[PDB]
């Protein structure tokens, strides 16, 4: 139990030197959807030997974005420019996975080919009063009414996850992650709060997992289990992605992932679960035990909980978001209990390749 965020870890193929993971974070510095030297510097900065990083959500197809200047990886151009980023990470000995991200209904005509309707599991839009999509000009507008996918039209989207995945590896990524929550596409099929379907993709918790299963099994076949993570924060009501029973929803996801590992054999790279974030951390254990494999914690963490997450064996490898945004050398700072730069929301999603991106300074040598 004396293990900590600094205890080495074997994540299948990858030997991590610590449990500090760079959580996947969209930063919108990938102008026009293609990676560049800014993302290269950004990731290389936060890289450490045996350190695991997850890329900002990356488009798996045209129309799969819901934010400005997010990187894509479904094409050759995107792939080519991703290489520099990945190389900048590998040169520094880190591991990097490309998150598989499709925003589904959480998009806008502005991000859709031909200014069309983003797709989803449902036709219901993300309620306006609570959230709005952020357009490239910086304004915030209402999420539009999404067109529910046709049952048959689903295996296609899967192809996009497969190509993008195969591309990820082509660009050198050590693997990919499955962004299955936060109200995005896959989640819109998982959450009963969103999934108002009645066909072969909805209703029963099992069917609600069908899309995720097809994507995971689809990408796995394409690149191999241990090269795939599948983030699922079923207790996060982001973008109206609520669920009547999060704990039981996650167990179904876990079950499906355990079933996959039994047949497919090899274990997935990991299961990533954002805290549902008195009572603000008693529900991760269940999945953190129901699952046969490495469990990544995310959401609200700091060194304090990270250590307890590992130490008190609450959870394996832990990903960090905002703190990593503000601390390129988060691992070091954490490892020595040093100062932590403060993060600034204003530049979370701006396009400056520098300001709010590569500015947070490393500790004074
Ligand atoms: C600017 C920003 C971008 C994010 N982008 C993504 C993303 O692209 N994919 C994803 O799955 N989660 C994303 N998240 C979820 C966050 O990773 C998670 O809420 C965050 O890491 C928690 O940071 P905090 O608890 O560690 O300090 C993002 C969060 C922020 C703040």
Swiss-Prot record:
Residues annotated for FMN binding in this entry: 24-26, 57, 99, 231, 298-300, 321-322
Active site (UniProt): 184 (proton donor)
Entry keyword set: Acetylation, Fatty acid biosynthesis, Fatty acid metabolism, Flavoprotein, FMN, Lipid biosynthesis, Lipid metabolism, NADP, Oxidoreductase, Oxylipin biosynthesis, Peroxisome
Pfam families: Oxidored_FMN
Signal sequence extent: none
Residues engaged in binding substrate: 179, 277
Tissue localization of expression: Expressed in green seedling, leaves, flowers (anthers, pistil, petal and stamen), and to a lower extent in roots and siliques. Specifically expressed in filament during anther dehiscence initiation.
Single GO MF annotation: 12-oxophytodienoate reductase activity
UniProt entry tagged with the keyword Electron transport: no
Catalytic activity: (1S,2S)-OPC-8 + NADP(+) = (9S,13S,15Z)-12-oxophyto-10,15-dienoate + NADPH + H(+)
Annotated metabolic or biological route of this protein: Lipid metabolism; oxylipin biosynthesis
Alphabetized Gene3D superfamilies for the sequence: Aldolase class I
Induction: Induction mediated by wounding and methyl JA (MeJA) needs COI1. Seems to not be influenced by salicylic acid, cold and heat treatments. Induced by infection with the fungal pathogens Botritys cinerea and Alternaria brassicicola, insect feeding with Spodoptera littoralis, and wounding.
Residues annotated as transmembrane: none
Family, per entry: Belongs to the NADH:flavin oxidoreductase/NADH oxidase family.
Its biological purpose: Specifically cleaves olefinic bonds in cyclic enones. Involved in the biosynthesis of jasmonic acid (JA) and perhaps in biosynthesis or metabolism of other oxylipin signaling moleclules. Required for the spatial and temporal regulation of JA levels during dehiscence of anthers, promoting the stomium degeneration program. In vitro, reduces 9S,13S-12-oxophytodienoic acid (9S,13S-OPDA) and 9R,13R-OPDA to 9S,13S-OPC-8:0 and 9R,13R-OPC-8:0, respectively. Can detoxify the explosive 2,4,6-trinitrotoluene (TNT) in vitro by catalyzing its nitroreduction to form hydroxylamino-dinitrotoluene (HADNT).
Protein name: 12-oxophytodienoate reductase 3
Organism: Arabidopsis thaliana (Mouse-ear cress)
């Amino acid at each position: 139990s004396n293990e900590t965020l600094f205890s080495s870890y074997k994540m299948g193929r990858f030997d991590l030197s610590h449990r500090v993971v760079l959580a996947p974070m969209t930063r919108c510095r990938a102008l026009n959807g293609v990676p560049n030297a800014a993302l290269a510097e950004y990731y290389a900065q936060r890289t450490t030997p045996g350190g695991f990083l997850i890329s900002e959500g990356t488009m798996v197809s045209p129309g799969s974005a819901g934010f400005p200047h997010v990187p894509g990886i479904y094409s050759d151009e995107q792939v080519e420019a991703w290489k520099q980023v990945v190389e900048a990470v590998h040169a520094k000995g880190g591991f990097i996975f490309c998150q598989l991200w499709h925003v589904g209904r959480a998009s806008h005509a502005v991000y859709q080919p031909n200014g069309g309707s983003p797709i989803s599991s449902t036709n219901k839009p993300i309620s306006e009063n609570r959230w709005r999509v952020l357009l490239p000009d910086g304004s915030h507008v209402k999420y539009p009414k999404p067109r529910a996918l046709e049952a048959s039209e689903i295996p296609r989207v899967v192809e996009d996850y497969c190509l993008s995945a195969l591309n990820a590896i082509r660009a050198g990524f050590d693997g990919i992650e499955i962004h299955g929550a936060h109200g995005y596409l896959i989640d819109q099929f998982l959450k009963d709060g969103i999934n108002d379907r009645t066909d072969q993709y909805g209703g029963s918790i099992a069917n609600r997992c069908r899309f995720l299963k097809q994507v995971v099994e689809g990408v796995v076949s394409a690149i191999g289990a241990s090269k795939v993570g599948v983030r699922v924060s079923p207790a996060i009501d982001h973008l109206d992605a609520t669920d009547s029973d999060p704990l039981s929803l996650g167990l179904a996801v876990v079950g499906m992932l355990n079933k996959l590992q039994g047949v497919n054999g090899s274990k997935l790279a990991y299961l990533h679960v954002t805290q549902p974030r008195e009572e603000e951390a008693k529900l991760m254990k269940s999945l953190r035990m129901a699952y046969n494999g490495t469990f990544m914690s995310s959401g609200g963490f700091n060194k304090e909980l990270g250590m307890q997450a590992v130490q008190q064996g609450d959870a394996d490898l832990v990903s960090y978001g905002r703190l990593f945004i503000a601390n390129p050398d988060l691992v070091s700072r954490f490892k020595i209990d040093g100062e932590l730069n403060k993060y600034n929301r204003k530049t979370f999603y701006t396009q400056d390749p520098v300001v709010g991106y590569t500015d947070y300074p490393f500790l004074a040598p």
